[PDB]
């Protein structure tokens, strides 16, 4: 009876592909053929934040667009003051293999994790003057790839294994487990309405989940290799992905299909980070060849290059007010552009 | 220029920088090694001996040993999945990679060695190759119950290298088999890289006690070779 279901699954799958085809009538490129081009965009580095012993993997802007936190493989977390380049805190880690970082929206907590299979949470506004560990979430069997804060008590993480999970910090237990992926999940992205979140795994597929229902809602497949990062959209009705086949693609939650692809012949390396501008007109992507291109999200035309790093770019972020974009790399330097 | 509170903020920042420097001295004085290998190998026993001689789903294990006033950190994954395509990029700055092989299903070990050697992010990393469980191989080839030619048809058409230094009490058959396996492993390493990194084969047993000394000597050789190449005299 194994085959009997397979046939149903194949026929059923087609019933979906046809439906998607039908629902498509025009291309986004044709619709935007009339609007004027965005023109050349020039950005120059304004700050250079140094002090990390080894390569850095992740960073996250604060809610006020003033503070930021970065994680490095030497086993340190550093909270920076972006304006004055000062250093606020320096947190040593139990395990030196860290892959992700997250800043709480309230500014009270910070989180990190990696190959140790543990999601640690640190208290910043403690009674005394030293940052201390407040909770250690241990329910995963792979490695932590990403983590995001919903509130001061809810956090969602993605692991090396297929499963994703939602935690309750007070109890330190799992309340919902998301399953359905085939490869390891690498990136994560929350919706602005904090009701849904997308996922990216190493099987060229992205899934849309419902936080309250705890069940997969939609699945998107348009890539050829593993997906590294997914940066959603300001509107929340679309999202972009970066994969290893040197492409970026824009999807939509409503029409449930691909819209446009951002690729160039001269680009061969993979993509490690994706983010959007404040208005959503600009798409910023990091690359393995030490560079960081800027794409017109409505025309798929390059509009600038953020050169200046010596090693590969590993993280990228944009402030809430959209005043600056910070870029990290494997040479242990952080830079801020305008 | 700066307010009273601003000056105190800068003073705290400069005090943090001083702590970072102090930690950098320790970070530069330690060498990190990654220990790979299959389940059938003796990698578990090797780390057990070093630890003795000197937490349920943890994804990595650490052991610290000291040889001649110098320190080493050795990591081995414990709870990751079979996939290794993604988490292998973290170890792109270690001093060396220790590869353990049960030479006593030998093809997939060669495939793993080939994949590790040719990785883009694992270039410029030397490999210390341990051919573990040699007594078992000696007692197995001597019995004659199983012949190596089936799996490897080219073994019959092969001779012991002239530079080989066999043990004075060992049969030449075990020497021929051992050096055939070693040459098969070295063929992959001697086909690419071209001076960026090298391999250091060894003939060891799981119960041996000189493994730490061998690792120390190989690390010293690697660092010395890097220094000589840097100053334009090698």
């Amino acid at each position, epitope marked *: 009876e194994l085959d009997q279901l397979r046939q149903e699954a194949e026929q059923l799958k087609n019933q979906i592909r046809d439906a998607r085809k039908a629902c498509a009538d025009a291309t986004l490129s044709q619709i935007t053929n009339n609007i004027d081009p965005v023109g050349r965009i020039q950005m120059r580095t304004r700050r250079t934040l140094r002090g990390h012993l080894a390569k850095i993997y992740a960073m996250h802007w604060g809610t006020d667009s003033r503070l930021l936190v970065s994680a490095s493989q030497d086993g340190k977390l550093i909270i920076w003051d972006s304006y004055t380049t000062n250093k606020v805190h320096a947190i040593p880690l139990r395990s030196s293999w860290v892959m992700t970082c997250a800043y709480a929206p309230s500014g009270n907590y910070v989180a990190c994790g990696g190959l140790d299979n543990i999601c640690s949470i640190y208290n910043l506004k403690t009674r005394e*003057g*030293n940052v201390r560990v407040s909770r250690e979430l241990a329910g995963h069997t792979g490695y932590l790839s990403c983590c995001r804060f919903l509130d001061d008590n809810q956090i969602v993480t993605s692991s090396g294994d297929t499963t994703c999970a939602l935690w309750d910090i007070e109890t330190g237990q799992q309340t919902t487990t998301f399953t359905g992926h085939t490869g390891d999940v690498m990136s994560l992205s929350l919706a602005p309405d904090t009701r849904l979140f997308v996922s990216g795994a190493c099987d060229a597929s992205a899934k849309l989940w419902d936080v309250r229902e705890g069940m997969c809602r939609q699945t998107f497949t348009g890539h050829e290799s593993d997906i590294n990062a997914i940066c959603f959209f300001p509107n929340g009705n679309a999202f972009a992905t970066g994969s290893d086949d040197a492409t970026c693609r824009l999807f939509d939650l409503r029409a449930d299909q691909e819209l446009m692809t951002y690729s160039h012949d001269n680009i061969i390396c993979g993509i490690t980070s994706v983010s959007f501008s404040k208005s959503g007109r600009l798409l910023l992507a990091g690359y393995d060849d030490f560079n960081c291109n800027v794409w017109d999200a409505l025309k798929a035309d390059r509009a600038g290059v953020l050169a200046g790093h010596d090693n590969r770019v590993s993280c990228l972020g944009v402030t809430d007010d959209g005043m600056a974009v910070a870029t990290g790399s494997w040479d242990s330097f952080l830079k801020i552009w305008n | 220029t700066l307010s009273a*509170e*601003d000056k105190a*903020a800068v*003073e*705290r920042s400069k005090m943090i920088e001083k702590q970072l420097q102090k930690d950098k001295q320790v970070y530069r004085a330690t060498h990190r090694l990654l220990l790979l290998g299959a389940d059938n190998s003796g990698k578990s026993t090797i780390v057990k001996q070093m630890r003795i001689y000197h937490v349920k789903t943890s994804g990595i294990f650490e052991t610290k040993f000291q040889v001649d006033k110098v320190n080493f950190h050795m990591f081995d994954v414990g709870a990751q999945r079979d996939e290794r395509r993604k988490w292998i990029q973290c170890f792109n700055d270690v001093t060396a990679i220790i590869f353990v092989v049960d030479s006593s299903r030998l093809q997939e070990a060669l495939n793993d060695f080939k994949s590790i050697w040719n990785n883009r992010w694992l270039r410029t990393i030397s490999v210390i190759l341990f051919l573990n469980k040699q007594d078992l191989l000696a007692e197995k080839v001597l019995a004659g119950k199983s012949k190596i030619e089936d799996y490897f048809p080219e073994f019959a058409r092969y001779t012991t290298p002239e530079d080989a230094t066999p043990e004075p009490g060992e049969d030449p058959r075990v020497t021929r088999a051992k050096y055939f396996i070693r040459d098969e492993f070295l063929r992959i390493s001697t086909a690419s890289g071209d001076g960026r990194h090298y391999c250091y084969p060894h003939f060891t047993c799981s119960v041996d006690t000189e493994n730490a000394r061998r690792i120390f000597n190989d690390c010293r050789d690697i660092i010395q070779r890097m220094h000589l190449r840097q100053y334009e005299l090698l």
Partner: single-chain antibody
Amino acid sequence: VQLVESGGGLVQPGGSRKLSCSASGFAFSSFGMHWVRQAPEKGLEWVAYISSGSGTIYYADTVKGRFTISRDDPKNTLFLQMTSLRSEDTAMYYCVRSIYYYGSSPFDFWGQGTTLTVSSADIVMTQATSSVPVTPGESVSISCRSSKSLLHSNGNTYLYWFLQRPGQSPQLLIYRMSNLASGVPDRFSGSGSGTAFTLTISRLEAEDVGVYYCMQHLEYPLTFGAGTKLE
């Protein structure tokens, strides 16, 4: 978090004494420290300051050449040395901790204090009223004045409010004119324009009885003010 001061007593004029304030319950090494004295019936006055790591020491003009302060981090003890005490040095001395970084709240904890009895372009803060009669269950609008614009170019203002109960050490209420300290009720609020400032209480119960002080932190010589008493 607790600080206890040791020493005090009676000393003849032109003598010497050493007061020690020992900390226990927090990371002493990462906190700057202050010494603040209160006259038998007057207001507060800042006398000394030692930074974290002992990299910066400041003194008041009154005791510049007679007092020296130092800290011993491993033993978590701080203590100053007094030489040639005059007859006006009689007061109660408090040790105050403060930490400085973006978004911090300095002057957030005060010690119990010890008593000792002996047998200029400076910003002047003036409290308009020395006593405001009031009942429980209405609003109060204590106000303060400054001789110089406390607003800085970076945006901060550096104005602090303190409340002292009848028989206890002072506690922080508002820092930088707009932020509640740690756990004070939402009734208190602060506002100002850089020269004139005011403090508002929505409702009063029996525990709002005390003296309300002021402070500035723009130029380092710290001036408090006479204070306003609510009874």
